[PDB]
Ligand binder design. Structure first.
Ligand code: HEM
Ligand code: HEM
Lengths: 362, 361
């Protein structure tokens, strides 16, 4: 229930241990006034400093003037910080405004068309994003709601996604969670302690060509539907072939323990792990940080389940793109469909109480 | 922590309120009474396992490689998490299997209420399973696996995820707040109040339907909140809507949340004043609802609200008179009922040989 520090060379919410709940919001900008937008970013940073510490925004949730609306909507009163992190990102479309064209990073790459793509343009894209992660879903909702409220007239929410439970891990010493296909998800990720690997694979460096992005990262988001009726009638052997690990322990095929190193030649040629492994993609490595979702029924008598997939990397062109290209033949494709997509440049961290979100860009 | 599955009553009504909810309504697709009773028996066997933290059937792995596993496996390595599984039967169930003359009179169709905007597709249902637990993945796994066991005899008509408090970080005697920022639950029937449960919640044999003795009647209302409008209202308007202050949740003119209200100090159309038993001939409800937030609609607005759940001994003397009295509720400016359903919740599963619905079938 403790707080995660807000300041740092990097934004929290990436290498931070993965909290239980997600409320992810993408926003479109509705003002042409660069000065107005910069003022918003500063006001948003001030609110985030309050929210991540478990304090109400502005002058609080009650006790102000009776005839004025409260500054904070109040549904997080009496709750602890609950490990809330708030991570902001800038979408490619944003750089068509405020004269930012020349500052769009090369590594903020548009994604190519992938086979099987069925992307809903409504729940895709976005000028910017805010990833709210916490162990308490009310805490995460309260933060998005109050950010949106502060931004009224300058931003609007384009689409949002809640994740009811994590399917990722940055802490290999704790239990690996399972996704809705029933397999452990997150075993061979990057841990928040592996500072060497985070530098090599996640954080943008000054030499990469975009100086204002040093210390930031790049985010790929893909909403993925799961064909659970199809999956749930497949044999256990079929499910285990699809991934290359057994369902119970999550060990690589042939081995006894979850964390034993995979032996790729023992897996089928189209097994998910075999195709996704760094060694199959010239060393390309990802920080996976996704969450499970369910949004009611599908209107055809079934539950609607999926995986909201999030990956951070140092360069989209050397992370998500090569790996996802290698998944064209993935056995898993038979049970999933990508139905939403967006990319964001995640700026560096807020260094101290004088700093603000996006200050290196603006 | 686990909650015993067997008892004179079904669990999940008077038992401690868990952190999360997965509520599902099912429609029946078979006409065969025997096949349906068979399913009820299979569901009961599975619920015994699920509520103890065990996988269904012969497990989620380690069986024949050529067969699908009995359990879909996403709850492996998790704890029982106080899972309760509560089943109810909708009025439309009794048009099947020759049950028409066994529908309880207390399972009454709801009138149309002013301002209703009910989405047919998120209303009704032949039966429901209320799954409550502290871990949402435990609740979802339960619904997902019951549906799979029932595939071919029942379909999922609609489904609602909910959250209340998070127990790891919040004390138990602290009242949760709803998404309007007000404490919700202050004056409610508690599960410790055996006498009030008997008077207001549990069906008695003399009530008129013997197979429902020990059961209860459930009203579900999916209530959307107009969040963005509410958040523009002044602090005074918000407190005037309810008749309590927002910070402490004390009735107007009082000092503590649990001070008994003085109804005459509240505005004539304040929510607490219209909902109070003294304003409804003594009618009292057990509220057990959950907040929801499903995402955002096509106009950028938050799709959130209160999934209202009320248990009562007779719908005609519980939910209906109180809701009728809210016709002029000042809260009506800010909410909209968009889904509704009623269910008869049968008595408990007495022992290892009993099953869901045995008193009706
Ligand atoms: C619903 C969609 C998906 C499911 C259910 C899924 C499932 C899994 C599972 C069960 C594992 C094995 C345990 C581990 O995390 O190490 C895994 C590994 C992995 N997955 Fe996925 N995955 C999905 C989508 C994706 C996508 C879209 C990508 C990349 C574009 C990806 C990249 C990876 C990588 C890099 C690994 C680690 C392989 C290794 O280095 O050993 N996954 N995934
Ligand atoms: C979005 C919808 C609703 C909200 C936000 C809401 C909120 C509240 C709040 C804040 C209280 C005061 C604290 C408490 O004693 O629990 C309360 C009391 C109460 N509400 Fe509501 N309510 C809603 C809908 C309903 C409905 C539909 C009913 C019944 C049909 C209802 C019946 C009651 C009752 C019986 C009380 C107890 C009054 C007393 O004995 O003091 N509420 N509600």
């Amino acid at each position: 229930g403790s707080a995660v520090p807000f300041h740092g060379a990097h934004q929290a919410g990436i290498a931070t241990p993965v909290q239980d709940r997600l409320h992810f919001a993408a926003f479109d900008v509705t003002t042409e006034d660069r000065a107005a937008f910069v003022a918003l970013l500063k006001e948003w940073t001030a609110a985030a400093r309050r929210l991540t510490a478990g304090h109400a925004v502005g002058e609080g949730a009650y006790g102000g003037l009776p005839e004025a609306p409260p500054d904070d909507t109040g549904e997080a009163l009496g709750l602890k910080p609950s490990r809330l992190t708030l991570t902001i990102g800038f979408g490619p479309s944003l750089f068509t405004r405020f004269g930012l064209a020349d500052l769009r990073p090369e590594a903020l790459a548009d994604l190519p068309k992938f086979p099987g793509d069925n992307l809903d343009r409504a729940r895709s894209g976005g000028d910017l994003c805010v990833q709210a992660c916490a162990d308490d879903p009310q805490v995460a909702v309260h933060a998005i709601r109050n950010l949106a409220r502060i931004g009224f007239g300058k931003v609007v929410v384009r689409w949002s996604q809640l994740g009811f439970g994590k399917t990722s891990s940055t802490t290999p010493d704790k239990q690996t969670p399972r996704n809705l296909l029933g397999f452990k998800d997150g075993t061979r990720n990057i841990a928040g302690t592996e500072k060497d690997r985070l530098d090599r694979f996640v954080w943008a460096a000054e030499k990469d060509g975009t100086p204002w992005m040093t210390g930031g990262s790049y985010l790929v988001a893909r909403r993925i539907r799961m064909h659970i009726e199809t999956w749930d009638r497949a044999s256990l052997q079929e499910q285990e072939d699809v991934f290359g690990r057994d369902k119970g322990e999550g060990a690589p095929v042939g081995k006894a323990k979850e964390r034993d190193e995979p032996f790729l030649k023992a897996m089928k040629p189209d097994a998910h792990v075999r195709l996704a492994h760094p060694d199959s993609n010239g060393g390309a490595t990802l920080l996976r940080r996704g969450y499970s979702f369910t949004d009611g029924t599908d209107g055809l008598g079934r539950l609607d389940a999926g995986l909201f997939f999030l990956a951070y990397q140092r360069d989209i062109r050397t992370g998500f793109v090569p790996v996802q290209r290698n998944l064209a033949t993935d056995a898993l494709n038979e049970y999933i469909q990508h139905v939403g997509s967006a990319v964001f440049a995640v700026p560096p961290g807020v260094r101290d109480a004088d700093d603000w979100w996006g200050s290196t860009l603006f």
